[PDB]
UniProtKB/Swiss-Prot annotation:
Role summary: Part of an orally active toxin complex (TC) with strong insecticidal effects on larvae of the Coleoptera Costelytra zealandica, Acrossidius tasmania and Adoryphorus couloni and some Lepidoptera larvae. The TC has an endochitinase activity.
UniProt keyword list: Autocatalytic cleavage, Repeat, Secreted, Virulence
An example Gene Ontology CC term for this record: extracellular region
Protein name as it appears in the record: Toxin subunit YenC2
Effect of deleting the gene: A double yenC1-yenC2 deletion is no longer pathogenic in C.zealandica larvae.
Source taxon at top rank: Bacteria
Name of encoding gene: yenC2
Intrachain disulfide bonds: none
Activity modulation comment: Toxin complex is secreted when grown at 25 degrees Celsius or less; at higher temperatures the proteins are present intracellularly but not secreted.
Length: 668
């Protein structure tokens, strides 16, 4: 038990201010050596943060961070070699007048990319809410990103409970008409207008022109709506989803879910749950899926730590009686996972005293080779025999400041071995796969002023756009042909409302067009008999359904329904159908490369994308997490979180050196 004498300590000035802090570190590879890691917080004449720094740049005697404020209050201006700079101002009332971003590290930082946001308001008598805000592009095409309409107090509005409501919010990707409300405060309805053609990347959803006499040129015919009724407690009583779906739900006395039903598009509504039951801790205890497979849950009653979860098929079931899993987990006193096992057999881990997970070992499938920018083939059919997977060691290395060095692996019986470097800046968190460059001075040129990265791969440029928005990646195409298109639409709250890719290389010119709305995705491979389908969100460990409109598959039914099983990260190792037949097994390294993959039907590569950490695969092999996108072979964000330093010093860092750490689904 290595951990003896690895405390942490915080230190203060005579004003009691948090001048310094210390963490002791010790690799189990280095059991005789204890590192002391420290950083500083200088404070000003105001009694507020003057300076705080990266440990390693600091002890290399370089200064790389800044924070500047009003007379008291809050930061006006703030820079890092990582973040770039940032400036804001707000009212006496805290209403915002201006914000700017993506400003470089020279006399002054580069304002030409400032991507300025500024705001327009309700005025007397109205309470003073913004009626609009605009992207005031510096020296360039300034454009009104959004517009708010606030209701009056007509009897109509009162009945709709829209009195004073933001009855419109025009926005990037279009408008929500906040178009009726219940007296509980929950909506009676909302209408969404997407753009006149949401396909058209250059109809900007910027509200030039004075009113929708103009803006009709920018809003769709394909307008959709949700309608809702609720508990006095506000929980949903029923709902309607204008493409043809609809909702009903029922609950236990504490408000826990008993049962639910959803209308499929233009058709029947049917029961989801067969059994659902919970612990005294309120957490789940005993369940049975709509296919009829049975689950139960197991906890340490002293602590409510989940020690395991078990699932089986009942007698005479369509897929036959079988234990499907019996997950068991091993923990240290703090609760870090030491090992796991399952039967339907084992894996194990090592940590630094600082709880960097330095090593992992277990089974991974042979022949997939060294993980790159790729997803290798499933084993097909589902392996009847186990030797196709084999022992591995996987290991990792890190800085005393918040940076990694290398990743290091063997699956020795496969002869698959590597050690692979993230080159990281001599003076920042900016860093890339060795393939892009091996040089830590040169690497810092590969990034924007915000510190967003230039490329996915040797030429795979990242189309960062105003409001820090990665509209597309170039991918690769022969002759650079746009027929293999890619792009995404983002709404005013960055919702990935549309996929707009395409393919035509040696194939039908199908646009991969897909739409993303509450409870809904619609996909078409169009522009051959076009593929056309919808999928609908079955709850919230969620459940998933399909219906083709067109493009019938071989040997597969339409209207198909599936449940799934995951590890606690929602790493979605398992999927199962309405007959209780498993679709396939899958698994991931902690770094998120797939450890095992198989299929019972070949094109399963498209059928499931909620996978590693329950995050969403892009078919290229990236994972979309929520706000942001991830490079699994690099084990790192392909993106920056600049939203707050108190959340962490490194914008690209994942999960405090253990991606397995938490249940947390957030993904920003």
């Amino acid at each position: 038990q290595l951990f003896s004498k690895t405390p942490s300590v915080t230190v203060f000035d005579n004003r009691g201010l948090s001048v310094r802090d210390i963490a002791y570190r010790r690799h189990p590879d280095t059991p005789k050596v204890t590192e002391e890691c420290i950083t500083y917080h200088q404070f000003d004449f105001r009694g507020f943060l003057a300076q705080s720094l990266d440990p390693r740049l600091n002890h290399k005697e370089v200064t790389n961070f800044s924070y500047l404020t009003d007379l008291n209050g809050n930061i006006i201006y703030t820079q890092s070699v990582d973040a770039g700079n940032t400036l804001v101002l707000n009212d006496t009332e805290g209403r915002s007048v201006i914000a700017m971003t993506n400003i470089s590290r020279n006399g002054k930082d580069d304002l030409s990319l400032a991507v300025t946001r500024t705001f327009q308001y309700e005025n007397a008598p109205l309470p003073g809410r913004p009626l609009s805000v605009t992207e005031q592009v510096n020296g360039e095409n300034a454009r009104i990103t959004e517009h708010f309409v606030y209701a009056g107090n007509t009897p109509q509005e009162k009945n709709l409970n829209l009195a004073g409501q933001c009855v419109s919010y025009y926005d990037a990707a279009g408008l929500i008409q906040t178009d009726s409300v219940s007296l509980t405060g929950k909506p009676l309805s909302v209408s969404r207008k997407l753009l006149k053609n949401l396909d058209d990347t250059n109809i900007l959803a910027d509200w030039q022109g004075n009113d929708t006499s103009a803006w009709n040129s920018l809003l769709a015919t394909e307008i959709y709506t949700t309608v809702t009724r609720t508990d006095a407690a506000g929980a949903v009583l029923t709902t309607i989803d204008a493409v043809g779906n609809q909702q009903r739900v029922a609950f236990d006395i504490a408000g826990q879910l008993s049962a639910s039903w959803l209308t499929l598009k233009g058709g029947q509504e049917q029961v989801i749950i067969k059994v659902l039951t919970y612990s005294a801790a309120g957490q789940k205890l005993r369940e049975e899926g709509g296919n009829g497979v049975v689950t139960t849950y197991t906890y340490e009653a002293e602590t409510q730590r989940l020690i395991g979860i078990k699932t089986e098929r009942p007698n005479g079931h369509a897929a036959g009686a079988k234990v499907l899993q019996d997950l068991r987990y091993e923990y240290d006193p703090v609760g870090n996972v030491l090992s796991i096992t399952n039967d339907a057999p084992e894996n194990a881990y090592r940590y630094d005293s600082l709880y960097q997970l330095v090593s992992a070992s277990g089974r991974e499938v042979a022949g997939a080779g060294q993980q790159g920018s790729d997803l290798p083939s499933p084993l097909v059919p589902l392996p009847s025999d186990s030797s196709v997977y084999t022992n591995y060691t996987r290991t990792y290395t890190y800085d005393s400041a918040g940076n990694l060095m290398r990743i290091r692996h063997s699956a020795p019986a496969t002869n698959n071995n590597y050690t692979l470097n993230i080159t990281v800046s001599e003076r920042s968190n900016r860093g890339v796969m060795s393939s892009l460059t091996e040089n830590p001075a040169d690497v810092d040129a590969l990034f924007t002023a915000s510190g967003s990265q230039k490329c996915l791969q040797q030429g795979q440029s990242l189309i960062w756009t105003p409001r820090g928005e990665l509209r597309t990646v170039l991918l690769v195409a022969r002759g650079e042909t746009a027929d293999d298109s890619e792009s995404y639409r983002y709404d005013g709250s960055s919702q990935r409302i549309l996929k707009i890719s395409s393919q035509q290389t040696n194939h039908s010119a199908r646009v991969q067009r897909a739409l993303y709305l509450p409870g809904l995705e619609w996909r078409t491979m169009t522009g051959a008999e076009a593929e056309n389908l919808q999928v609908i969100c079955i709850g919230e460990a969620q459940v998933r359904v399909l219906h083709w409109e067109s493009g019938k598959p071989d040997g597969i039914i339409n209207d198909q329904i599936r449940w799934s099983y995951d590890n606690l990260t929602c790493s979605s190792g398992l999927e199962v159908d309405g007959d209780g037949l498993v679709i396939s097994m899958e698994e991931y390294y902690p770094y998120g490369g797939t450890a095992v993959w198989a299929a019972r039907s070949h094109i399963e590569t498209a059928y499931k994308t909620v996978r590693y950490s329950g995050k969403e695969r892009d078919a290229t092999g990236l994972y979309y997490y929520g706000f942001r996108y991830y490079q699994p072979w690099a084990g790192r964000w392909l993106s920056a979180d600049p939203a707050g330093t108190v959340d962490g010093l490194n914008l690209y860092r994942m999960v405090r050196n253990n991606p397995l750490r938490l249940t947390d689904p957030d993904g920003m």
